[PDB]
Enzyme design. Structure first.
Site, PDB file in Angstrom:
ATOM      1  N   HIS B 506       3.750 -14.556   9.262  1.00  0.00           N
ATOM      2  CA  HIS B 506       2.419 -14.426   9.866  1.00  0.00           C
ATOM      3  C   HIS B 506       2.573 -14.146  11.356  1.00  0.00           C
ATOM      4  O   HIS B 506       1.764 -14.663  12.173  1.00  0.00           O
ATOM      5  CB  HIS B 506       1.577 -15.706   9.625  1.00  0.00           C
ATOM      6  CG  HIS B 506       1.094 -15.877   8.206  1.00  0.00           C
ATOM      7  ND1 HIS B 506       0.583 -17.072   7.738  1.00  0.00           N
ATOM      8  CD2 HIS B 506       1.028 -15.005   7.165  1.00  0.00           C
ATOM      9  CE1 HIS B 506       0.219 -16.931   6.468  1.00  0.00           C
ATOM     10  NE2 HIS B 506       0.475 -15.687   6.095  1.00  0.00           N
ATOM     11  N   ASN B 551      -4.187 -18.084   7.560  1.00  0.00           N
ATOM     12  CA  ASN B 551      -3.540 -16.794   7.222  1.00  0.00           C
ATOM     13  C   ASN B 551      -4.309 -15.670   7.939  1.00  0.00           C
ATOM     14  O   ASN B 551      -5.523 -15.630   7.821  1.00  0.00           O
ATOM     15  CB  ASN B 551      -3.553 -16.553   5.703  1.00  0.00           C
ATOM     16  CG  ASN B 551      -3.436 -17.848   4.882  1.00  0.00           C
ATOM     17  OD1 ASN B 551      -4.365 -18.633   4.814  1.00  0.00           O
ATOM     18  ND2 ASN B 551      -2.295 -18.044   4.217  1.00  0.00           N
TER      19      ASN B 551
HETATM   20  C1  LIG Z   1       5.247 -11.269   1.889  1.00  0.00           C
HETATM   21  C2  LIG Z   1       4.069 -12.199   1.892  1.00  0.00           C
HETATM   22  C3  LIG Z   1       3.003 -11.897   2.756  1.00  0.00           C
HETATM   23  C4  LIG Z   1       1.863 -12.710   2.693  1.00  0.00           C
HETATM   24  C5  LIG Z   1       1.776 -13.737   1.732  1.00  0.00           C
HETATM   25  C6  LIG Z   1       2.872 -14.030   0.889  1.00  0.00           C
HETATM   26  C7  LIG Z   1       4.024 -13.251   0.981  1.00  0.00           C
HETATM   27  C8  LIG Z   1       5.302 -13.665   0.226  1.00  0.00           C
HETATM   28  N1  LIG Z   1       0.620 -14.502   1.634  1.00  0.00           N
HETATM   29  C9  LIG Z   1      -0.474 -14.191   2.466  1.00  0.00           C
HETATM   30  C10 LIG Z   1      -1.683 -14.896   2.390  1.00  0.00           C
HETATM   31  O1  LIG Z   1      -1.964 -15.566   1.386  1.00  0.00           O
HETATM   32  N2  LIG Z   1      -2.714 -14.531   3.257  1.00  0.00           N
HETATM   33  C11 LIG Z   1      -2.570 -13.533   4.190  1.00  0.00           C
HETATM   34  O2  LIG Z   1      -3.488 -13.253   4.974  1.00  0.00           O
HETATM   35  N3  LIG Z   1      -1.385 -12.836   4.278  1.00  0.00           N
HETATM   36  C12 LIG Z   1      -0.354 -13.169   3.420  1.00  0.00           C
HETATM   37  N4  LIG Z   1       0.781 -12.426   3.526  1.00  0.00           N
HETATM   38  C13 LIG Z   1       0.898 -11.528   4.728  1.00  0.00           C
HETATM   39  C14 LIG Z   1       0.135 -10.209   4.556  1.00  0.00           C
HETATM   40  O3  LIG Z   1       0.555  -9.590   3.346  1.00  0.00           O
HETATM   41  C15 LIG Z   1       0.311  -9.285   5.759  1.00  0.00           C
HETATM   42  O4  LIG Z   1      -0.325  -9.962   6.877  1.00  0.00           O
HETATM   43  C16 LIG Z   1      -0.442  -7.958   5.550  1.00  0.00           C
HETATM   44  O5  LIG Z   1       0.026  -7.155   4.448  1.00  0.00           O
HETATM   45  C17 LIG Z   1      -0.340  -7.122   6.811  1.00  0.00           C
HETATM   46  O6  LIG Z   1      -0.982  -5.873   6.583  1.00  0.00           O
HETATM   47  P1  LIG Z   1      -0.606  -4.648   7.510  1.00  0.00           P
HETATM   48  O7  LIG Z   1      -1.303  -3.483   6.902  1.00  0.00           O
HETATM   49  O8  LIG Z   1      -0.848  -4.835   8.988  1.00  0.00           O
HETATM   50  O9  LIG Z   1       1.015  -4.364   7.402  1.00  0.00           O
HETATM   51  P2  LIG Z   1       1.954  -4.324   6.069  1.00  0.00           P
HETATM   52  O10 LIG Z   1       1.335  -4.933   4.817  1.00  0.00           O
HETATM   53  O11 LIG Z   1       3.288  -4.806   6.477  1.00  0.00           O
HETATM   54  O12 LIG Z   1       2.042  -2.743   5.875  1.00  0.00           O
HETATM   55  C18 LIG Z   1       2.772  -2.009   6.837  1.00  0.00           C
HETATM   56  C19 LIG Z   1       3.159  -0.642   6.252  1.00  0.00           C
HETATM   57  O13 LIG Z   1       3.651   0.201   7.288  1.00  0.00           O
HETATM   58  C20 LIG Z   1       4.793   0.924   6.752  1.00  0.00           C
HETATM   59  N5  LIG Z   1       5.702   1.283   7.833  1.00  0.00           N
HETATM   60  C21 LIG Z   1       6.503   0.461   8.604  1.00  0.00           C
HETATM   61  N6  LIG Z   1       7.154   1.225   9.482  1.00  0.00           N
HETATM   62  C22 LIG Z   1       6.800   2.536   9.329  1.00  0.00           C
HETATM   63  C23 LIG Z   1       7.127   3.738   9.975  1.00  0.00           C
HETATM   64  N7  LIG Z   1       7.862   3.866  11.074  1.00  0.00           N
HETATM   65  N8  LIG Z   1       6.557   4.909   9.501  1.00  0.00           N
HETATM   66  C24 LIG Z   1       5.677   4.875   8.485  1.00  0.00           C
HETATM   67  N9  LIG Z   1       5.315   3.724   7.844  1.00  0.00           N
HETATM   68  C25 LIG Z   1       5.880   2.563   8.292  1.00  0.00           C
HETATM   69  C26 LIG Z   1       5.458  -0.057   5.791  1.00  0.00           C
HETATM   70  O14 LIG Z   1       6.198   0.576   4.778  1.00  0.00           O
HETATM   71  C27 LIG Z   1       4.296  -0.846   5.234  1.00  0.00           C
HETATM   72  O15 LIG Z   1       3.988  -0.367   3.935  1.00  0.00           O
END
Ligand SMILES: *Cc1cc2c(cc1C)nc1c(=O)[nH]c(=O)nc-1n2C[C@H](O)[C@H](O)[C@H](O)COP(=O)(O)OP(=O)(O)OC[C@H]1O[C@@H](n2cnc3c(N)ncnc32)[C@H](O)[C@@H]1O
Ligand SMILES: *Cc1cc2c(cc1C)nc1c(=O)[nH]c(=O)nc-1n2C[C@H](O)[C@H](O)[C@H](O)COP(=O)(O)OP(=O)(O)OC[C@H]1O[C@@H](n2cnc3c(N)ncnc32)[C@H](O)[C@@H]1O
EC number: 1.1.3.10
Lengths: 577, 577, 52, 104
Positions: B506, B551
């Site tokens: 987080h 969260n």
């Molecule tokens: C892993 C996890 C997370 C989690 C959770 C339990 C687990 C085991 N339980 C949660 C909960 O109950 N409540 C909550 O609010 N969050 C919980 N989480 C965390 C949550 O999943 C994350 O806060 C959320 O998904 C964040 O969303 P965001 O859209 O900001 O970012 P992301 O999901 O990480 O997606 C990022 C995407 O960007 C792509 N990426 C990364 N680098 C690049 C580059 N350079 N170029 C193009 N794309 C890129 C990634 O691949 C990713 O898909």
């Protein structure tokens, strides 16, 4: 969703896909059902390790495998937990808990045996090793004529190798691969031959191998479509196939009873031909739940009416495993042709070789790779490039060493202490033994306990047979200890050991093939047709009746191809309407 | 492939999809890039636990999570392996091995921080908990007007909950849920309130809950399509977004440089609006690669030209965890309304209750489920039905207990000794603390070391601040010990413990929001626009500048909704011609 | 270590741990027989396993 | 710092030490066998209250050491076994084996 098809296939693993490729391409209207769902990207049923993320960190892929293996039969747990707080609820007995199977004798199990329920079956995670069986491991297809048998097998294997895109060239320029291959070739000169493991895979780049799967065999896309406007195919995921309905005469299947797991609806599906390719355990379950063989604990005083050999003569390979850490001698040999001047990290550090020199022990391409790594990465103490592919070495099963071997790397869960050893040094050793088919080794199904899909719970009664199987299994462990020592000492935490019985997942013989039902104690004939039944075929490892050490998928596929040939000669495709 | 769009979005997580939903719906021509690939089935970006197989065997899902979490920064390994064979190659130093980061101080790390690179990001595996922040945890959107600020937060959170399909009713008829809920309600009567954790999920049946994901927010299908013939959206997976190009005045972004991982080709993509939603770590990495902040080890003598607070004030929550085994008192209370005659297994065994009786402790629906389980499964020693859903209980963060709480079940790998405990008895406890933002807590990027995608390697310099953060962390541990004892004793092997720093995932504050770049030490304003730049916006938990225990995703989504309102007022969608 | 070397367990129930990675040539039990000084009278869930 | 809190256990007739008539120990004597559970009621409630008290009190000194987290020890590892030949004033009335002179 139609009521009527020419061919219905249960299961979308690579063997189900073999039936689909053959029968769809020959004009049949085909439906295929899978109890699991689509989850391999846009290429349906494809290998999950073909993402850029897994090609970059192979070790994470072990979690994908573990995530889709569900233990077949878990005995009642008898572990004593006596440090609960006095306020917590505490059992008075070891009662039936957490999906365990009270039918299961924990000392006669295949505890490692597991199943996968996803579209593409286990081929979405498999290691892709596809060797042929030699004669001694291979079921007969032609009686009393060895040359015709060889030629039939060569024809079938060759087509199956085409479907899987099997090759022995994908790792040819890896330094580690050649380092291991050349040392073992020399050590066993005139005694044993070594080569690349045959792998169902195509190299796309020096850092990407496209591993094969069910999808390589057949893309699982509904037809007709643009690329295939005359073909007819529907895939139905999340559909439990529960039973084939026998006519009273036991000569024909009349329908396939299914349970749609999304909608909850049950249907009876009708076809000319029914093909079961749900895996070695689940083909057997479906048959037993349809009134073949015997439900409940085996009773030799109450013989079953149909297929009395079903679920007997089961085989599972013995597996031994260790890892090694490459010898100093071998590592120094990688840089044998180099002239090194100065001190790493200084300005006057120089690594050179004379290309083509007669005194060079390695080819120019190898020496270029080593020189570039040593020159561009002077802080690194090893001569192997960071991106050098893993070894993929085998010496195939022979009578004087009757086990299959893999000397290689696949996905592994390293302990934090092991992560201490540079990955370039580590080589995996896996030797697989053959197991004699014995009537007493059984897979049976409870008449009371049910599994997670409410089907009769599978129960094993299995021990590695005394005699040859057992002696060979121990000789096999010794052979791995002797051979691996030529490459390096064991890696701590991965010392030579037998794997949990069944963890190999090469279960065979549950619905075994032979010429004669009674004489060969079998369930299907050489066309994979269920004895007595005009329109019911089984495909997969459960057909293989022999003791085999090598990975069996390619052999199951070869049998499935032969099966489709019978089908093509005996059933007419509906006209395009 | 076009190289010109109205809006480009980097990242396909739920925050990237919030921008897509808003801006595609308002008629902009949008492209979205993800370095990861499609692998959630036909519903692109959906929750991987939505398969029937994971609904039946939830404990296997822990493997799916582990397979897609890649550690951000792993320090050099110093474990001593001194039982190698003398023939094996053996290191003289603890040299840089196996992707480890030599910049990382192992004692100032967030060792548990990891990233996911897949379409849908981490919302393909997340727990779905979406509570709102109360005032004390929440960034101000309106200054000097608490009521307007509340009203604006309510509007945003309401829309965010609609996007995620947040609800508090999906577990209302679980016996285990109500058993825990009612007991904690009673124990804290007048002191704390308990309710269901707000979950982004829709119940489909008594045994199936459809968990939300990026897909819920936006389905990620290319547009135009049949369902949306006037919208324009393209998703481009396996594309590494590397840098945004600044103009000489540092007032506008001029292009996005991308790297197609399949073809190997590089392109410059043109847009009117650039949105970075790559996650808290990777937004920071892309900005630093584009000349924002400072590359390399922090050097206060050499101030960064742009966004000097980027990568400073990072926050991560403390997390404490245990499991408990339900008390005998609670278990017996489950059947308090039952009259039991005779003994189980016999003919005269009877379990009855009187519906509607005023002395009953439990509603009819509960007594009926208990009655039927005990009557139909007389071999089973517990009164809880086998398919009874898990608890999902919280008491939300408050000043007198400043931590978030989840008293529930999610995916867990039980040791063989723990698997000895009936799963109906087990409850997970996770309390999350808030961490004060401090300038010295930093995420920075090496100028020599690179990661798996050849980008500057992320390095943490982090400790939980002294003072309030640390005291509250330990008070939270004690609160968990005290509150869990009311439900049952600790489960051996899951004793009360702090989790590895960052394993919670987080991470906040890496590119934080505030009103004034200098006065509020921040990187974006309240429209999430990067200071000084007309057309660059950041979305995600990295924007959150406060100390929070709940969260954060729902809050980040609410900020992205407000950001989209600014974009819709300041940029004109191209004509659909 | 001094302490552990002079504490002898009073009542050790019959061991039901499954070892199923023995080599096929090794002698293997068919039942959990009374082995290594274990006490078959002992209910493992009503013990004082630490008493010595 | 080590923390060890020791609870009191109500004496109950059903909690027994007995000796096998067939199995023998290393000295060829009748093999001891326990039939024991911490009694419900006060004993059990106090044991869990005791655990909580250790969690609360220990926090005033420091957080838990990983690998030595709060836990109940294996029953009897404490070795404070009592009551197997217990004292009282009257054999029948006090359910006992010796008097206050420790005489049988
Ligand atoms: C892993 C996890 C997370 C989690 C959770 C339990 C687990 C085991 N339980 C949660 C909960 O109950 N409540 C909550 O609010 N969050 C919980 N989480 C965390 C949550 O999943 C994350 O806060 C959320 O998904 C964040 O969303 P965001 O859209 O900001 O970012 P992301 O999901 O990480 O997606 C990022 C995407 O960007 C792509 N990426 C990364 N680098 C690049 C580059 N350079 N170029 C193009 N794309 C890129 C990634 O691949 C990713 O898909
Ligand atoms: C998991 C594994 C397997 C494996 C391997 C490594 C691992 C970790 N390495 C191998 C190797 O290198 N070489 C080789 O030859 N095999 C290797 N394997 C084993 C291989 O994957 C299997 O032999 C092969 O996949 C078997 O193919 P088959 O098509 O017969 O069976 P399947 O893949 O298990 O697919 C069965 C499908 O049936 C569905 N199913 C099951 N029950 C039902 C019901 N009742 N109704 C409808 N469908 C059902 C399953 O979902 C499955 O998809």
């Amino acid at each position: 969703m139609d009521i009527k098809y020419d061919v219905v296939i249960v299961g979308s693993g690579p063997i189900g896909c073999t039936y689909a490729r053959e029968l769809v391409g020959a004009g049949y209207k085909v439906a295929m059902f899978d109890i699991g769902e689509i989850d391999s990207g846009l290429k349906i049923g494809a290998h999950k390790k073909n993402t850029v993320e897994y090609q970059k960190n192979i070790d994470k892929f072990v979690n994908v495998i573990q995530g889709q293996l569900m233990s077949v039969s878990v005995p009642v747990n008898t572990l004593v937990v006596d440090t609960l707080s006095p306020t917590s609820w505490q059992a008075s007995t070891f009662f039936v808990r957490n999906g365990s199977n009270p039918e299961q004798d924990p000392l006669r199990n295949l505890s490692g045996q597991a199943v996968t329920r996803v579209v593409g079956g286990m081929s979405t995670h498999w290691t892709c090793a596809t060797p042929r069986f030699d004669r001694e491991q291979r079921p007969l297809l032609v009686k009393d004529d060895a040359d015709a048998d060889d030629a039939e097998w060569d024809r079938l294997y060759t087509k199956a190798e085409s479907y899987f895109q099997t090759g022995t060239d994908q790792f040819k320029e890896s330094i580690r691969h050649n380092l291991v291959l050349n040392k073992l070739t020399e050590e066993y000169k005139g005694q044993r031959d070594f080569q690349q493991i045959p792998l169902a895979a195509t190299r796309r780049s020096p850092t990407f191998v496209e591993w094969s799967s069910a999808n390589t065999v057949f893309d699982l896309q509904n037809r007709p479509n643009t690329d295939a406007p005359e073909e007819r195919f529907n895939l139905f995921p999340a559909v439990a196939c529960e039973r084939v309905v026998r006519n009273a005469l036991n000569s024909e299947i009349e329908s396939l009873h299914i349970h749609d797991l999304i909608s909850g609806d049950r249907f009876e599906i009708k076809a000319d031909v029914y093909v079961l390719t749900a895996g070695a355990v689940h083909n057997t379950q479906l048959l037993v739940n349809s009134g073949f063989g015997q439900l409940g604990r085996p009773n030799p005083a109450n013989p079953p009416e149909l297929l009395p050999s079903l679920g007997s003569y089961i085989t599972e390979q013995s597996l031994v495993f260790c890892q090694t850490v490459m010898s100093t001698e071998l590592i120094d040999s990688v840089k044998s042709d180099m002239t090194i001047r100065g001190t790493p990290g200084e300005l006057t550090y120089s690594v050179t070789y004379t290309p083509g020199a007669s005194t060079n022990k390695h080819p120019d391409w190898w020496n270029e790779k080593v020189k570039n790594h040593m020159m561009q990465h002077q802080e690194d103490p090893l001569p192997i490039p960071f991106e050098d592919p893993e070894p993929q070495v085998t010496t195939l099963f022979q009578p004087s060493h009757p086990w299959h071997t893999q000397i290689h790397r696949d996905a592994f869960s390293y302990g934090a202490v092991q992560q201490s050893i540079d990955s370039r040094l580590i080589v995996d050793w896996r030797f697989f033994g053959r197991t004699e088919p014995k009537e007493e080794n059984k897979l049976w199904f409870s008449d009371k306990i049910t599994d997670a899909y409410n089907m009769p719970q599978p129960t094993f009664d299995f021990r590695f047979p005394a005699g040859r199987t057992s002696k060979e299994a121990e000789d096999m462990m010794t052979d791995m200890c002797v051979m691996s020592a030529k490459i390096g000492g064991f890696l701590p935490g991965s010392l030579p050991q037998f794997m949990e019985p069944g963890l190999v997942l090469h279960l065979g013989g549950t619905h075994r093939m032979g010429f004669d039902e009674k004489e060969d104690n079998c369930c299907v004939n050489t066309d994979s047709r269920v004895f007595g039944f005009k329109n019911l075929f089984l495909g997969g490892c459960g057909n293989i009746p022999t003791a085999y050490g090598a990975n069996p998928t390619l052999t199951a596929m070869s049998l499935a191809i032969k099966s489709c040939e019978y089908i093509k000669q005996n059933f007419t495709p509906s006209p395009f309407t």
